Amino acid sequence: SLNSTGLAQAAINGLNARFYESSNARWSSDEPWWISGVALTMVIEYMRRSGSKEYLDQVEDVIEVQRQPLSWWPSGEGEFRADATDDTGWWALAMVRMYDLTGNEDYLNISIKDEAYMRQWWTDTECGGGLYVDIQDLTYKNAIANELYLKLVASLANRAPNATIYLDRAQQAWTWFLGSGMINGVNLINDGLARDSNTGSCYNNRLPVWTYNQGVILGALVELYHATKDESYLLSAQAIADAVLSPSNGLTSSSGVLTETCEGSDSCNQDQQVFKGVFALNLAELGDAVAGASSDPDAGQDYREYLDTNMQSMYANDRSEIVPTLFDSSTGDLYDVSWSGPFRNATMPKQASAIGLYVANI
Numbered sequence: 001s002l003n004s005t006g007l008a009q010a011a012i013n014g015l016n017a018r019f020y021e022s023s024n025a026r027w028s029s030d031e032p033w034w035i036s037g038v039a040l041t042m043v044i045e046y047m048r049r050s051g052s053k054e055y056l057d058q059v060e061d062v063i064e065v066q067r068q069p070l071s072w073w074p075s076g077e078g079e080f081r082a083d084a085t086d087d088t089g090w091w092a093l094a095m096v097r098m099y100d101l102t103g104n105e106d107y108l109n110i111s112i113k114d115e116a117y118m119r120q121w122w123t124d125t126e127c128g129g130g131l132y133v134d135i136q137d138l139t140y141k142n143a144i145a146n147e148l149y150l151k152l153v154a155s156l157a158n159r160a161p162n163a164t165i166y167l168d169r170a171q172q173a174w175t176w177f178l179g180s181g182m183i184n185g186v187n188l189i190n191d192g193l194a195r196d197s198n199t200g201s202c203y204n205n206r207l208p209v210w211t212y213n214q215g216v217i218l219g220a221l222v223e224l225y226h227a228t229k230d231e232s233y234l235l236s237a238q239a240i241a242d243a244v245l246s247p248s249n250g251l252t253s254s255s256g257v258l259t260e261t262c263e264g265s266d267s268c269n270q271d272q273q274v275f276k277g278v279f280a281l282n283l284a285e286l287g288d289a290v291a292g293a294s295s296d297p298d299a300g301q302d303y304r305e306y307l308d309t310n311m312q313s314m315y316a317n318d319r320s321e322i323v324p325t326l327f328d329s330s331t332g333d334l335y336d337v338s339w340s341g342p343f344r345n346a347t348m349p350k351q352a353s354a355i356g357l358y359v360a361n362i
């Protein structure tokens, strides 16, 4: 059969062999900085799920260098506080993951500083809540920045000392998200909100449905369930996941393979190339929560079967290996954007999205 642990390591080795820069403690400086944060999350989650620790030294190096004041946003004063609330959000959740792996309180402190940073741009005056993504411009309250924040306050509600304040924030934040209108008629989440030019009211902008906007929200609801023991959060998360798995919604193909909307026109940019892996990692978190919340042995079987179906299609149609030489003994696997389509090239976001699918099957 297929061993996801050995393939996750092979995919991580291909990511490092092709894109890691030892002189910068970062993957691919030519790619968005926040995707290096997603990459660290995939590697941390691999170690936590496989019990390994082979990349712990490398990961600790990345944190030490990237936690310094960013050259393009010095006013953030480091600790992953950047010029966009979602850029900060990806690194903050990675620090929550590292705290889960190591138990070192230093990493939890970074998440606490990041929560207080992002909360600065939550306003009740526009759309009745939510935070902005563009710290400099302050014109867009989108879905991904509010999903990252919601999963951050919900995670702190289970780990931080002053857990009650964080639980109140998460409960008020989910209530705003649910009532914002970003969740549409088929329980899928569009990109963000638009504002009426005359009334000041906000509404679903009907922008595309991206896969990672259906995943981060699942992990936030799992943390909310863990902090309240209320299964109502799991049932809402299961409705969002079921809509993704339904082939009638255009995100799951007739073969059962997850497909970004940009794959048909072959126009997935550097951001969209990483989306699918973020969903698969969060879906596996939902499945673990569903299987434990009930005694039925088939609990969460559809989510595990879905991840297994997608792992096999990527393995067979999207794989390519690096050429070993007489000098470089580097080995591993490379992957493209389509988890069923052909392999043409490999980019760091595509590779990080592929790691997440294997780690979701561990």
Ligand SMILES: N[C@@H]1[C@@H](O)[C@H](O)[C@@H](CO)O[C@@H]1O
Binding pocket: 032, 033, 034, 083, 084, 086, 087, 133, 271
């Ligand atoms: N600050 C922006 C982010 O909001 C955005 O997500 C990335 C995308 O590349 O570019 C910049 O870093």
